[PDB]
Each structure stands twice: as C-alpha cells, then as structure tokens.
Amino acid sequence: PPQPRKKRPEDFKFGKILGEGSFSTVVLARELATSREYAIKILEKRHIIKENKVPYVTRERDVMSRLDHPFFVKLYFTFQDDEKLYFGLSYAKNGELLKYIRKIGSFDETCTRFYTAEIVSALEYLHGKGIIHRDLKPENILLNEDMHIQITDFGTAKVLSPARANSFVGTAQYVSPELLTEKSACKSSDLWALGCIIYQLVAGLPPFRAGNEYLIFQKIIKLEYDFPEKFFPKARDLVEKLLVLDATKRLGCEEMEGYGPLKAHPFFESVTWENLHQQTPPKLT
Ligand SMILES: Cn1cc(C2=C(c3cn(CCCN)c4ccccc34)C(=O)NC2=O)c2ccccc21
C-alpha cells in the first residue's frame, strides 16, 4: 500500500531539548500540517560512523519498528537530511518514572502493584518477540499523559535467535550478575532488573548502592542487599524470587516456565492482567 510523503525537517517547528545524549539529542517538535507533538531523536551520521555505532542505531530502529503495544514508545517515522538522522518518537508527556519516585519517596502497595504489573505485562510482550531490553530502569520507563508506562531506549537491546551473545553493560545498579561473571545475557537479565525496580518503588532506593561502580558490582555478585522493615511482605517475597544469582531460577524465565507463574504470584492477587492500559492508574501518593 502507498505510504504518506517522506517527511523532512521543514515539516516541523522544533522546540525545547528534552534530553541530551552522548550520540544523540531528543527534541520536542510539532508537526506543521497536523499540529501533533512528537519527541524527535536526532543523531549525526558522522559522529555515529566515527564512533562505530551503526549497529546500535540500526538495531534501535529495527527493534522499535517491530514493537506494537501500548506500553512501548512508538516510532512513527524516520528521515534524514545530509548530516542528520531523525526518529519520530511518541512523546511521553509525564516523563521518566524515576521523577515520580524522587518526588514522593516510595510507592505505597497499590501504586507499586499497578505499575509493576505494567512493567511485567510489557516485559512479557517484549520477550514474546525474543527481545531483551538489556538496560531497563526507571529512567527508561516513561509515563504518558494518562500516567500509563511507556518503555523506551532500545538501541542497546538484543534480538535472540538460539540466552545468547553479548556487548555492553547497562546502568550499574541494574546489571545482573551473569553480565559480570559471564559476559553473556538472556531474558532473565531483564527480570533481575525488574526485581531491582520493584525494590526501588517500595524502598525509594535501588537494592545495590555503593561509592562507585566497582563496588556495586562487588555487591551484586555476592548478592549483598537487605530489605527495610516496612517492606510489603508479598512484595519482598516476589523480589526474593527475582534477585536470584542463578538466572535459571528467576520467577518468569523459561526454565521457570514463563510468565504464568510470575503473574500468578500472590503480590498480584487483585491484578486484572487483560486490560491494564485501559484501567485508571492509582493516584501517585
Ligand atoms: C521527558 N522526556 C521524554 C523523553 C522521551 C523519550 C526518550 C527517553 N529516553 C530515556 C530517558 C531520558 N531521560 C530515551 C532514550 C532513547 C530514545 C528516546 C528516549 C522517548 O522515546 N520519548 C520521549 O518523550 C525524553 C528523553 C530524554 C529526556 C527527557 C525525556
């Protein structure tokens, strides 16, 4: 079927910079003909070529094209002028999840449950297509205008074909031990991350903290962390079935028999998994 015109820079009115990266910048832009707002990621071809990132830029584009779910930032289009690449991304009006965590300290039982259920839901979809995020964190979990989550940042993801290959290491506090002792990663890697996130929603801080990265990696492989007193019991329990050094024993992985058991965990008792994105999120305390 024929497609709409290939878009070009002039079709937009660029506005504020939302965020600046090492090899890119996200700029909020407004499309002239439609008046729609898109968050446009811009990258300089020369810089990318100079830094051997073609693999990372191509992957991000490819992975996102394949995605088609309400909990993932959509990639509306792409185009390029002589020196730059533009990626039309959906604009999450309420920003990073982390913002909220800092704004209110920790989440209460209901808000933790709800949002954790979306992450899980989103992870089940992703893994369903044999895709590993590899750097999941509150910074990558955005919130749309309705306060529903929207995972983004897939340039460092990985597509499976065998648990497989390797490359980089995501943010320190979310790295699973297998990456520190095996230089290899699988789906559970995202599960370990999930465990960390859940723990952070409840305690206000991630499981492994230390003066530097080398120190956090030291705690990770030794599994050094502990729960705070008021930590919701069922939540605590779920987290213990997630932060397991052995990646084949994490609740939710293939060897553990998938997402059935995970969604069936007591912590999600009252969750209705079927239409999460059509439910009204609990007001963030
Ligand atoms: C308000 N906000 C939304 C951002 C958005 C996105 C974004 C957000 N991140 C990660 C968090 C950046 N702080 C990205 C990483 C790679 C590519 C895009 C993003 C996005 O995909 N849509 C957005 O609306 C964003 C990015 C950087 C800084 C602030 C941001």
Curated annotation (Swiss-Prot):
Domain Protein kinase: 12-268
Activity modulation notes: Homodimerization regulates its activity by maintaining the kinase in an autoinhibitory conformation. The 14-3-3 protein YWHAQ acts as a negative regulator by association with the residues surrounding the Ser-167 residue. STRAP positively regulates its activity by enhancing its autophosphorylation and by stimulating its dissociation from YWHAQ. SMAD2, SMAD3, SMAD4 and SMAD7 also positively regulate its activity by stimulating its dissociation from YWHAQ.
Catalytic residue positions: 135 (proton acceptor)
Binding locations of ATP: 22-24, 41, 90-92, 96, 139, 153
Enzyme Commission designation: 2.7.11.1
Main location: cytoplasm
Entry-annotated residues carrying Phosphothreonine: 280
Reactions the enzyme catalyzes: L-seryl-[protein] + ATP = O-phospho-L-seryl-[protein] + ADP + H(+); L-threonyl-[protein] + ATP = O-phospho-L-threonyl-[protein] + ADP + H(+)
Topology relative to the membrane: Peripheral membrane protein
Listed GO MF terms: 3-phosphoinositide-dependent protein kinase activity; ATP binding; phospholipase activator activity; phospholipase binding; protein serine kinase activity; protein serine/threonine kinase activity
Segments for region (PIF-pocket): 43-87
Subcellular location, record wording: Cytoplasm; Nucleus; Cell membrane; Cell junction, Focal adhesion
Modified residues (Phosphoserine): 167
One GO cellular component term noted in the UniProt record for this chain: cytoplasm
Keyword terms: Acetylation, Activator, ATP-binding, Cell junction, Cell membrane, Cytoplasm, Kinase, Membrane, Nucleotide-binding, Nucleus, Phosphoprotein, Serine/threonine-protein kinase, Transcription, Transcription regulation, Transferase, Ubl conjugation
Up-regulation conditions: Stimulated by insulin, and the oxidants hydrogen peroxide and peroxovanadate.
Outcome when changing residue 280 to A: Abolishes phosphorylation by MELK
UniProt note: domains: The PH domain plays a pivotal role in the localization and nuclear import of PDPK1 and is also essential for its homodimerization. The PIF-pocket is a small lobe in the catalytic domain required by the enzyme for the binding to the hydrophobic motif of its substrates. It is an allosteric regulatory site that can accommodate small compounds acting as allosteric inhibitors.
Function, as annotated: Serine/threonine kinase which acts as a master kinase, phosphorylating and activating a subgroup of the AGC family of protein kinases. Its targets include: protein kinase B (PKB/AKT1, PKB/AKT2, PKB/AKT3), p70 ribosomal protein S6 kinase (RPS6KB1), p90 ribosomal protein S6 kinase (RPS6KA1, RPS6KA2 and RPS6KA3), cyclic AMP-dependent protein kinase (PRKACA), protein kinase C (PRKCD and PRKCZ), serum and glucocorticoid-inducible kinase (SGK1, SGK2 and SGK3), p21-activated kinase-1 (PAK1), TSSK3, protein kinase PKN (PKN1 and PKN2).
Subunit structure: Homodimer in its autoinhibited state. Active as monomer. Interacts with NPRL2, PPARG, PAK1, PTK2B, GRB14, PKN1 (via C-terminus), STRAP and IKKB. Interacts with SGK3 in a phosphorylation-dependent manner. The tyrosine-phosphorylated form interacts with PTPN6. The Ser-167 phosphorylated form interacts with YWHAH and YWHAQ. Binds INSR in response to insulin. Interacts (via PH domain) with SMAD3, SMAD4 and SMAD7.
Name the record gives this protein: 3-phosphoinositide-dependent protein kinase 1
Species whose genome carries this gene: Homo sapiens (Human)
Positions spanned in the full protein: 71 to 359 of 556
